Amino acid sequence: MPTLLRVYIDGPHGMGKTTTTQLLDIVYVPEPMTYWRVLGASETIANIYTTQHRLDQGEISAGDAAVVMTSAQITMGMPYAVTDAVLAPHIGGEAPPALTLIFDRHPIAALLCYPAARYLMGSMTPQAVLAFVALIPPTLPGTNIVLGALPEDRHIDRLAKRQRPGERLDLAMLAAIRRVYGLLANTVRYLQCGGSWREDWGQLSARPHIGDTLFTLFRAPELLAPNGDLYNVFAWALDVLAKRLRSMHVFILDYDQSPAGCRDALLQLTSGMVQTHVTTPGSIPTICDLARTFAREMGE
Amino acid sequence: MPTLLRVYIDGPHGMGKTTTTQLLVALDIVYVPEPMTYWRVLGASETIANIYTTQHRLDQGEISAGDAAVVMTSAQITMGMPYAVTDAVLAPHIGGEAPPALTLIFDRHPIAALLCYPAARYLMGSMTPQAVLAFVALIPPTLPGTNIVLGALPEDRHIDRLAKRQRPGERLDLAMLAAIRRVYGLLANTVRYLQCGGSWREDWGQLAGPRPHIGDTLFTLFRAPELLAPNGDLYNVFAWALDVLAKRLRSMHVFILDYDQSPAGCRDALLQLTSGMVQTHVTTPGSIPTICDLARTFAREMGE
Numbered sequence: 001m002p003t004l005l006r007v008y009i010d011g012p013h014g015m016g017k018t019t020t021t022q023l024l025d026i027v028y029v030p031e032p033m034t035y036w037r038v039l040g041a042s043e044t045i046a047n048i049y050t051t052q053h054r055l056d057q058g059e060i061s062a063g064d065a066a067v068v069m070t071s072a073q074i075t076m077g078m079p080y081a082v083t084d085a086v087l088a089p090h091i092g093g094e095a096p097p098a099l100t101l102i103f104d105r106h107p108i109a110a111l112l113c114y115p116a117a118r119y120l121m122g123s124m125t126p127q128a129v130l131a132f133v134a135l136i137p138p139t140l141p142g143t144n145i146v147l148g149a150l151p152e153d154r155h156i157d158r159l160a161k162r163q164r165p166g167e168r169l170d171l172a173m174l175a176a177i178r179r180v181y182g183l184l185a186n187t188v189r190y191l192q193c194g195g196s197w198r199e200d201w202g203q204l205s206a207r208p209h210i211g212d213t214l215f216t217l218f219r220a221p222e223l224l225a226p227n228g229d230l231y232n233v234f235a236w237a238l239d240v241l242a243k244r245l246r247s248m249h250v251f252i253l254d255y256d257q258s259p260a261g262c263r264d265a266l267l268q269l270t271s272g273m274v275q276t277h278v279t280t281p282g283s284i285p286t287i288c289d290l291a292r293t294f295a296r297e298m299g300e
Numbered sequence: 301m302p303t304l305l306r307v308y309i310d311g312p313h314g315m316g317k318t319t320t321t322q323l324l325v326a327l328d329i330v331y332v333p334e335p336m337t338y339w340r341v342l343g344a345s346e347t348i349a350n351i352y353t354t355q356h357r358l359d360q361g362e363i364s365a366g367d368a369a370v371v372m373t374s375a376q377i378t379m380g381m382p383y384a385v386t387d388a389v390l391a392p393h394i395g396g397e398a399p400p401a402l403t404l405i406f407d408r409h410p411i412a413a414l415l416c417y418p419a420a421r422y423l424m425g426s427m428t429p430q431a432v433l434a435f436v437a438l439i440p441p442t443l444p445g446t447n448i449v450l451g452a453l454p455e456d457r458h459i460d461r462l463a464k465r466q467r468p469g470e471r472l473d474l475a476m477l478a479a480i481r482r483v484y485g486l487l488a489n490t491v492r493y494l495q496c497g498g499s500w501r502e503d504w505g506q507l508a509g510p511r512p513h514i515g516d517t518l519f520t521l522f523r524a525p526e527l528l529a530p531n532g533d534l535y536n537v538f539a540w541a542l543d544v545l546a547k548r549l550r551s552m553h554v555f556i557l558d559y560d561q562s563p564a565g566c567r568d569a570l571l572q573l574t575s576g577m578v579q580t581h582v583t584t585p586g587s588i589p590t591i592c593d594l595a596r597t598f599a600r601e602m603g604e
């Protein structure tokens with residue numbers, strides 16, 4: 001059957017990601033803004049940033065924050081999750097392509113990166129983070145993930161110029177999310193170089209050091225037993241983390257250039273990306289409508 | 301290679317489910333229990349208590365539906381966590397459909413936390429139908445050999461027994477008993493509907509044994525005004541969530557166990573049903589031992 005190329009442009013918010021994808025037999029699955037502001041719940045982006053503000057202000061407790069942040073992250077990841085579930089059966093083994101699917105973010109942004117960042121923010125429990133991790137859908141073949149690079153001071157500049165409605169400029173949240181995605185990129189390399197977190201776990205007390213991968217975040221006292229040992233349930237959540245990330249193809253896009261440049265840069269990276277066959281000839285058209293319908297309904 | 305038999309004993313609470321499985325294992329069979337220690341300690345503090353108090357508060361009007369929902373949605377994540385990792389860690393060892401060299405008796409299936417309780421809580425006014433669908437979209441792929449046993453018990457018998465099966469922190473909420481009973485009845489119907497070639501998209505306009513009316517399956521719950529577009533049609537996102545619902549439930553093997561008997565009887569009844577259950581091969585003959593430790597470690601750490 002025809003081949004399909006899927007590209008998930010992910011990374012921290014405030015880099016120009018949505019723009020450069022606009023700038024690119026190619027369909028675009030944008031940011032689920034209408035689902036975040038209306039369909040799933042009322043103004044979720046606003047709810048998220050206010051809560052952190054309240055928490056930071058001490059007007060609420062960490063536990064209230066957590067209960068709100070955990071509930072909000074469910075809403076934020078819903079469109080990403082169904083799309084993947086409805087898409088999964090059409091994806092065949094790894095294989096110009098007959099269809100290029102450009103996505104605005106992968107499911108891991110809602111199910112992993114933002115939760116870890118919010119945990120780093122004091123607004124989410126590490127146990128919840130692992131619950132979302134356990135819920136990460138099996139990584140299909142041809143999962144090419146593009147993460148962005150941008151010097152911090154420059155990022156503060158782009159971050160400022162484009163806050164979604166309800167957003168607040170939280171530089172603390174900018175540092176946590178940037179940290180989380182940096183670790184995510186390291187975790188993939190670590191894993192692909194044969195890294196075994198169980199073996200390198202003690203080091204927390206070619207290939208990155210386990211202390212430079214996401215695994216270092218789960219060395220939290222809530223997840224450890226009176227003797228330091230990670231509880232098995234959590235250890236298993238890490239086995240899933242390892243599993244999900246290892247088959248992902250990560251590509252780095254430098255956002256410290258102009259929109260036409262980022263667009264150009266994104267097109268070059270496209271060559272080393274993994275393609276796949278679809279499961280039926282009629283998967284291409286179906287995938288198309290899916291994307292085109294997702295956009296029409298949830299795009300804003 | 302060796303074969304494996306998986307049996308998930310599910311259904312409403314207060315029926316004696318956990319008991320009969322203990323009894324069954326007391327008879328190459330490992331038991332994966334309700335993860336109470338994870339609910340009361342490891343994942344969070346006294347989650348069962350949190351759940352029932354919230355409903356109480358809500359019912360009392362001491363809090364709003366929106367607060368309730370934020371708490372129920374968060375609590376249900378904690379409740380389903382052990383179920384979810386267990387399935388993800390188990391999934392690669394499961395081979396195609398095939399005396400089992402190992403029988404894995406589970407205490408509920410991931411759908412109890414990811415589907416049934418949420419729908420029930422939605423029915424209770426403590427959860428949004430949008431949240432319910434988010435959990436439904438997170439339901440892990442249904443492995444081959446997923447035999448689910450659901451229980452039957454007349455309402456009055458259940459009512460009295462419920463009162464006799466209060467978990468620490470639970471309250472006798474008969475409204476929640478009716479909602480959950482309703483949700484699981486629908487679940488059983490949905491599976492038959494699906495196996496009889498039912499298409500919710502076709503029967504949408506309408507909202508063993510023959511096929512049920514879509515109005516008697518879970519699909520009827522999602523005919524909620526929150527999920528309805530200006531034109532009266534379901535939003536696509538939610539329609540897709542129902543495609544996943546249909547997909548996940550259609551490959552499940554549902555068996556009904558009558559709990560209106562004695563514990564030794566339920567145990568005996570459970571053993572007969574075991575014959576028509578689907579077995580599967582493991583992916584590595586050494587999957588058998590691994591699965592064993594998994595279950596034996598899950599129990600030792602989360603059982604309580």
Ligand SMILES: O=c1[nH]c(=O)n([C@@H]2CO[C@H](CO)[C@@H](O)C2)cc1I
Nearest residue numbers: 013045048073076105109110114164
């Ligand atoms: O799970 C998520 N959680 C969030 O808080 N966001 C944020 C939503 O608002 C903006 C969308 O980029 C960013 O500020 C990220 C995104 C996701 I995807």
Ligand SMILES: O=c1[nH]c(=O)n([C@@H]2CO[C@H](CO)[C@@H](O)C2)cc1I
Nearest residue numbers: 313348351379408412413417467470
């Ligand atoms: O998702 C769930 N949510 C729940 O509220 N429960 C309830 C928890 O308390 C008892 C044991 O699980 C029953 O009252 C069910 C179980 C599950 I599994």
